[PDB]
Design a protein around this ligand. Sequence first.
Ligand SMILES: Nc1nc2c(ncn2[C@@H]2O[C@H](COP(=O)(O)OP(=O)(O)O)[C@@H](O)[C@H]2O)c(=O)[nH]1
Ligand SMILES: Nc1nc2c(ncn2[C@@H]2O[C@H](COP(=O)(O)OP(=O)(O)O)[C@@H](O)[C@H]2O)c(=O)[nH]1
Lengths: 369, 282, 370, 370
Amino acid sequence: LHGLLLDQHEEFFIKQFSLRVEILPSYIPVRVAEKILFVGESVQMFEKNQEDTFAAELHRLKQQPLFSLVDFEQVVDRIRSTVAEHLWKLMVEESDLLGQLKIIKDFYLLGRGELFQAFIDTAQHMLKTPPTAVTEHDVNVAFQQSAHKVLLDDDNLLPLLHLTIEYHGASGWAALGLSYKVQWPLHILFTPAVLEKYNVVFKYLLSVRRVQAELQHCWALQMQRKHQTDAIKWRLRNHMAFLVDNLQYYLQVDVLESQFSQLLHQINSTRDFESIRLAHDHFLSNLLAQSFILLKPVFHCLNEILDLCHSFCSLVSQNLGPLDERGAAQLSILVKGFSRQSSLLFKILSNSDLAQLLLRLDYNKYYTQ
Amino acid sequence: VNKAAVDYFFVELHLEAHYEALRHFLLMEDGEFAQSLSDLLFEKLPGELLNPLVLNSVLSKALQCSLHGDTPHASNLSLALKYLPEVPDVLSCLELRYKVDWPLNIVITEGCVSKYSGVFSFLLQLKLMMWALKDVCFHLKRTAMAGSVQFRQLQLFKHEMQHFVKVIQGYIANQILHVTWCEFRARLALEEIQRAHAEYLHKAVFRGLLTEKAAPVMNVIHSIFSLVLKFRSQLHPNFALMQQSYNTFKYYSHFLFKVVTKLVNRQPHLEDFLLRINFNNY
Amino acid sequence: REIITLQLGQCGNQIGFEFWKQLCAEHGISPEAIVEEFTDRKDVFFYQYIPRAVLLRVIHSILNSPYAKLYGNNWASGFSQGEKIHEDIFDIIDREADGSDSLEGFVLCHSIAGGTGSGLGSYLLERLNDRYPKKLVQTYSVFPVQPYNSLLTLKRLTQNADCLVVLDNTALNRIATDRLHIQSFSQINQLVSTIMSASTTTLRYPGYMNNDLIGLIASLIPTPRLHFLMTGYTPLTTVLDVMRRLLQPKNVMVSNHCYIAILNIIQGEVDPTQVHKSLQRIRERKLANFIPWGPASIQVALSRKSPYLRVSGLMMANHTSISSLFERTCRQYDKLRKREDNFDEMDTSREIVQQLIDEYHAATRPDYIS
Amino acid sequence: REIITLQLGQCGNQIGFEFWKQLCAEHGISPEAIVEEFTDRKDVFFYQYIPRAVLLRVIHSILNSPYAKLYGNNWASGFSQGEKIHEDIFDIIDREADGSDSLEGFVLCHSIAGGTGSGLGSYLLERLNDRYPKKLVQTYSVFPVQPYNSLLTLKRLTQNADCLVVLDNTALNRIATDRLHIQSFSQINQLVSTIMSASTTTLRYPGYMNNDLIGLIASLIPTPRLHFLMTGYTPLTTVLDVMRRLLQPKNVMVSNHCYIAILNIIQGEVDPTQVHKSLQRIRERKLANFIPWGPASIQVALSRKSPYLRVSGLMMANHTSISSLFERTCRQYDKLRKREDNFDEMDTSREIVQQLIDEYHAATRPDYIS
Ligand SMILES: Nc1nc2c(ncn2[C@@H]2O[C@H](COP(=O)(O)OP(=O)(O)O)[C@@H](O)[C@H]2O)c(=O)[nH]1
Ligand SMILES: Nc1nc2c(ncn2[C@@H]2O[C@H](COP(=O)(O)OP(=O)(O)O)[C@@H](O)[C@H]2O)c(=O)[nH]1
């Protein structure tokens, strides 16, 4: 009720506080122990009529000559739901939780994708080289220039995004990261742990957004080269290697704009605060699974398609004429590996892979492989 | 008590007035005063200009040409000194201290006013350029028939050197007088008054390139200010002697743009400087 | 990445204004080109507000409208005029290119039947490829001495315009009678503007992909030859409801055969979870035939309707049945060739279009490659 | 330091009158030259109130105005009349000169459109350099046998007037019809008086920088030859709104090329924290182009409006495009030179301006030095 503990000998079963199990009573269930620790931490971090009534109820229990567990929970569950209801008010109505979530979906989950394609166009040569101690700030001015480049102007929420470079403990993209300075009220919901799993997703989603862009540039390079017999072998493999990434880049609006549609629904329905802490924690857990990141095989197979395509788009752009000096001799090496990986993933597919295979085989082409 | 203590200061003793008044005099915000004080002192230049008969009286002649002041606030401007100069440089040490009474002395610290004297001697030193440089711009006017390559090529140096001073001044007139004054004016509206004031001035000496952290940026400024003074000495008998001087000026300025850039990786205040010194150039 | 739009010929200048009055209406833009009070990314078509247009008798009709502050008939005759105003118009075009930050494409509205279009539209496509070689040139051309203007122009659109969308007036005049009951030009243009507007929906609103003109076309055109598309506008309610009306040829403006790739655009607020359920039943019913040679897929995209102005729908189709329309035209061309300085350019043009119709008829075979 | 004005011809006496009305309105000065009850230093223009005016037909109506208590057609004839009253008029100047504490400059409001004042303007500047060699002179000349009287006074203005603010009636009337819809003389001058009033915002109100007439001119004009300026006045809302609306050629009061120096005066109470941000966005978009040789920048200073009388702003620039205006004039001269006691002064006049037109075109080259 007051956010402080009166203990000096390691007596209470609550020692950023934690919970103790090896000293917890026997008949008391671990469930209600989770309820207690939450109401106490929520007041400590917080630093009318809901005070005296809780006191008398606590005192009344001491007069009962029999501790009935069915009644001990009967008073605690009201107190938990009491502080949670008022906290849910502060977490949504006064402090716009939904507005912050929209900003998250934009910059962390590539929601504002148009900003990141111009960001790549500028911060391209200053990242392909191995990162050093100066490229950390050399790119922040490019990103700031990018937001102003698409007439998105707001002195709010712009200085809250500071790109980091994991240096001295390799290409620059392998160490790129984006941190967000959370405000005070939302600190209870945004720990560095939940902001860490968000950061991992941002690296993978930015990778596939990079390879599709430079690949589309190759498409504009063949079209530009309209007037060699072997010259057609490029687009017969380019357009082939295009559908393996483009469709891989689909199912993402069908997993982001869908899961996000449920999390945005779960808040506007329940008045409790505990629901938010579990639904949001459940919402993020799907992104690790549905986006095929945790599953090593699908994560280890398409991983090779990324860097294999880098060599291809670079090879065709590294020359201005036909691939003659061992260039065609080099193109014939990737197709011997890629075309096998195409059938390899076809065997991996044959819970959610149907939503991916349906788009890949609606035209029934992979049935022939 | 506290709400009645702070309110007692504003509505009765005019704490809001003293701040917006010392800025009119110390930080030289009110024109026609610095342009009249510095303009008088610079007319002379040892034993003269040091006795309390001229420098203790030039102020009482300056305030009349202010057209703003002559109030009980306007007094207490002790135009004293802190050194006896012996004898082309860019230094003339001289202080200018405000004075207060009891119920206000407890807030405005006797150390804070001492730091105004730190930022003042810089701002006065700046005026020494825009007057001496104005002199050669005016000294050359009477020379005008005499039109030749030696003449026009000479005057382009002044326009090339003046613009560098008129941009570093435009910076000072943006950080130490307007944005650092936006804060501490919409910040106020009893212990806090001590710290808020200790944060207003401290930002004024930080954005003012007087901090020892960015001191190497300040050391280079003297090389610029010195060469302009030499340019004033040679008011075409010695043209080439001046042509070498300007070439030294273009080198040092070209060196400043590199030392400030290298000091960006390690201060958002300095960020606006490069945008000032560099614009459509390298 | 902005797109400079050009409009030539009477038909082209007419559809553009109706495309412009439609676009600025979707945003909060007053006819005086000033924002009204009343997220929507508006940079792709407007310069900081002015639209990046270059309009080329009818101009008087445009300046008399309250939107004033918004800014012979032979193939040989139209071309000759072009070379005479060569330098005059390019300074207008060049200054708009340097003004833009990173110019990406060139939207063109012109009619092959239109004399001015058959003379001036054809000349630009050769010059545009010469001066700026790294810029896509996509045209919203519309099919209708008449066969001559048509085939001679098709000779340029098959090698210069790296993309193209055809709008046939025959099917449009038909749709006007059955589901609109008009019987003029001033009524059929209403639906034309609807197509062009929804065609560029994903670009004007921030999304996940499809943030450039390349983001839409590259999935459709696999080879430099197969570069012809078709559109379909259904609403004249679930996600499965809208798709079953797309594939019906009763709404597609057209008069074995199979597609190449499909792009679906949905402008409603439908639940994006059941879209994967809709595709499954479509593959089960097998409502559209495909190519067996290469890997292809059916795509769908979502966006948001203009709030300041319910589910709509537009589909982008790459069908080989569009080759028949060419044959009909070229058939009439051969008909006038045997009935009536060198008369040789019209001869080679007939040969090069023979390759195009050949490429599509050979595309519907299991051995289209080589 | 006191400033004094002189008004010549019919034009100068008209705009100077409304210049005296608008300025008298800024301070709490009744039309009867008496302060009403109702910071601003009013001593630079007014002398105890009495304005330092010197007026040289319409004067009768000026005294007939409620502000009475506030005090041929050839060029050679306009020059002759100035000689016939050499000493008679000059006494007024002298008695007003030393009777003033410290004269700083001489504001000259006159027209060069063939008026008796146009010659009358040529004479005074010759003598002003004769008697007072330490007194700056500024002139707010206005542009339209008219080629004759125009090109002649240019010969005197390029060597006597150390500064000049050009105002062409042509670019003014474009503003009149567009944003005031007049389709008169007393209608356009309403805006002209506004330009001059805000031109001295930093003088009547004390500030840190630019507290004197030499404080504004010394930065822009690099050499005593390239001494021509143009103006801008946008309010007809943050800082990035003002400076961006100023650089447009739709607002400039003038009919390769680049700038030498700009000065933007902001009169509002705007938040000064964003003035550096607007400077960044103007640089990055590259909306203006400067000289390549020397480091040329843009400067901005703040001041406060008249509390008695909303964000205003003035733009002062030295653009080498002003050379085109002269080319329009002198070209007419050669045409009138072949169509119609010595006629030798007209020769050296045409000669000296052609040196100036050479001096501008040479400033735009990266090797302007030597
Ligand atoms: N869809 C559409 N087509 C038009 C319109 N106006 C003209 N056309 C087409 O243009 C052709 C006639 O060309 P015409 O205007 O005579 O060419 P011009 O004389 O060079 O302008 C017809 O076959 C029409 O199909 C219009 O408003 N909409
Ligand atoms: N900009 C402007 N120009 C004017 C105005 N009134 C007259 N002028 C110019 O003055 C010229 C006529 O001069 P005029 O009065 O006959 O000369 P005067 O008789 O010697 O004073 C015309 O060519 C006009 O362009 C005015 O209100 N504004």
